Write a protein that binds this ligand. Structure first.
Ligand code: VJF
Ligand code: VJF
Ligand code: ZN
Ligand code: ZN
Lengths: 338, 338
């Protein structure tokens, strides 16, 4: 899996041990941990394969962040805070809830000030409760000046050269992630390039390449859980998702100062280590490089994923109702392509 | 089925008896036999439902045609003549044979002069052979003057008013069909409006509306047998085509002077009656009325058929190879829409 856990400097003991990792049915192989000076890492990023960069200093001024420093300087803005009854957080598109009334949310969002989220957090911890919170908020301009200069201290020289050397679109947003220990963002894929910059705590990252689409069974494109796996990693229904017995992931554990390149359309399962405290992450999202003019075959796996996405979308608009997409596709293939 | 067989004028006995009809597994109901003066027939054509018109006089000058008269006056042109080992004639798109090398033809076309087709026909009949021929040739300008004035004697006044009253495109071709008794054109659908004008002999016509697509399992759009049913009507494989046990057809027997409106996208199975002699038919093909601007829901069954056709076609061009259309569609629906 994540291999032997790393030893921290000053003989401060192992960063983590295997008992902080949850258990799953599939095998994993390690994502390489390299230096940004190492051309191997430059090659993996160009080939859109994940790599963990150990020395970008991307969010070096942010490494001092904790709950106290942030609450004092983050400002008086509103922060999206997602609550969950269990460790699996259930995210959904609230716009697409119009198409699936038979879908009930179990992880609702709540806007609140940063001091309210910290108050609500220690309230759960002193009460011994089991409710979980996950703060996910795009950084805007309403943030204090001390956090502003921390932001200015990011290694923009390195990441901008990466944005230009790959031909990516410009940075779209910076997402701040403050999660509780044991929190799980279940497997899903994103449509942009991601630099996963870990700040506080450790996160286990399990990635699946786009060519394992048929092993991970994403929800219908019109479903509020579009881009998420239907497979319950904790209780995989092998009768509904038989190819999940063939899935094989890429695994790593990122700590403070580590930066994980999650390529676009790559599945990822992110969990904050059990009994590891709160985790802090900042994501850098870039739109992928524009699709080239000369179409070259064979197609990349992610290009076929985009094709299936658009067939579903266009079929939903053509039939006038997304709920008829399913039966028409079965009509199209039953006894004709299977 | 076709109901009680009609009695011919002058007490010349029944036109046909049930023993000339082949046997099939599905039930049928009769296509109405009306007069073109009857507004009910005008309503069926407008609703794109089949009707048999008994008194159009559409091909009145052609009713005198037989093998001898045609051979003398049809001219010295080349006629497409399809040969078959069995009663089921196997038609295919020769352009699409590039995609399915694993497909071998069993009914080859042969160009020949009209006198050669008649010579080859009586050759089979005197030899007692079982090889079958089917002449199918679009009428052109290379045809003799006596046939030209027969053509001019067609009821263009009636059929042109029908072409205008429905908003159809112009006439695209006239197909002459001369078949042997027992010949079968297996079930398929056409993309144009058809006026089926019977001249000599009797043909049993079995039609299925477009909403029975999932009962009739057409070949993949890129297959040389695109638009034909994969179901062998003589030996239906219920394990591969289970919804064929739900199919229900519309049946009629057309004779000399009868005109059958086969609406666009309607399946049809056409067989020349057993022991009925040669059959002669002329088809009038019109492109359907252009799709209206304001898209109105619910969609017609044939509109959904066009949607599935175009998804298959566009997917074949996007992937660069029609043979990958199947696996991608299964990947798209397996565990996601079924
Ligand atoms: O818990 C963890 O640490 C993992 C985690 C927290 S949030 C997350 N993903 C998203 O929020 C979706 C991004 N989708 S996007 O199309 O690329 C996009 C859309 C809009 C702006 C910018 C980008 N992951 O994987
Ligand atoms: O044996 C019988 O009596 C039945 C019979 C003989 S041929 C036949 N069908 C076709 O040849 C296909 C027409 N397809 S089309 O798209 O509308 C079209 C294409 C090009 C020009 C004009 C029209 N049927 O059903
Ligand atoms: Zn993500
Ligand atoms: Zn036809």
């Amino acid at each position: 899996g994540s291999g032997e856990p790393r030893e921290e400097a000053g003989a401060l003991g192992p960063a983590w041990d295997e008992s902080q990792l949850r258990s799953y049915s599939f095998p994993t192989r390690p994502i390489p941990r390299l230096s940004q000076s190492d051309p191997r890492a430059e090659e993996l990023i160009e080939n859109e394969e994940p790599v963990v960069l150990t020395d970008t200093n991307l969010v070096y001024p942010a490494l001092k962040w904790d709950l106290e420093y942030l609450q004092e300087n983050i400002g008086n803005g509103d922060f999206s805070v997602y609550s969950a009854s269990t460790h699996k957080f259930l995210y959904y598109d609230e716009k697409k809830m119009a198409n699936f009334q038979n879908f009930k949310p179990r992880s609702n969002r709540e806007e609140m000030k940063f001091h309210e989220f910290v108050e609500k957090l220690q309230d759960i911890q002193q009460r011994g409760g089991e409710e979980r919170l996950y703060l996910q908020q795009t950084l805007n301009d309403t943030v204090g000046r001390k956090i502003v200069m921390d932001f200015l201290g990011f290694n923009w020289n390195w990441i901008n050269k990466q944005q230009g050397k790959r031909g990516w679109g410009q940075l779209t947003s910076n997402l701040l992630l403050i999660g509780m220990e044991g929190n799980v963002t279940p497997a899903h894929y994103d449509e942009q390039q991601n630099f996963f910059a870990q700040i506080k705590g450790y996160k286990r990252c399990i990635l699946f390449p786009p060519d394992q689409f048929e092993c991970l069974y994403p929800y219908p494109v019109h479903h509020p859980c579009d881009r998420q796996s239907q497979v319950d990693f904790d209780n995989p229904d092998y009768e509904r998702f038989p190819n999940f017995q063939n899935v094989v992931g890429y695994e790593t554990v990122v700590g403070p100062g580590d930066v994980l390149y999650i390529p676009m359309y790559w599945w990822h399962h992110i969990e904050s280590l059990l009994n590891g405290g709160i985790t802090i992450t900042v994501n850098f999202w870039y739109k992928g490089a524009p699709t080239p003019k000369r179409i070259e075959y064979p197609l990349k796996a992610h290009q076929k994923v985009a094709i299936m996405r658009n067939i579903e979308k266009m079929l939903g608009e053509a039939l006038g109702n997304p709920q008829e997409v399913g039966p028409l596709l079965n009509t199209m293939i039953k006894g004709r392509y299977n």
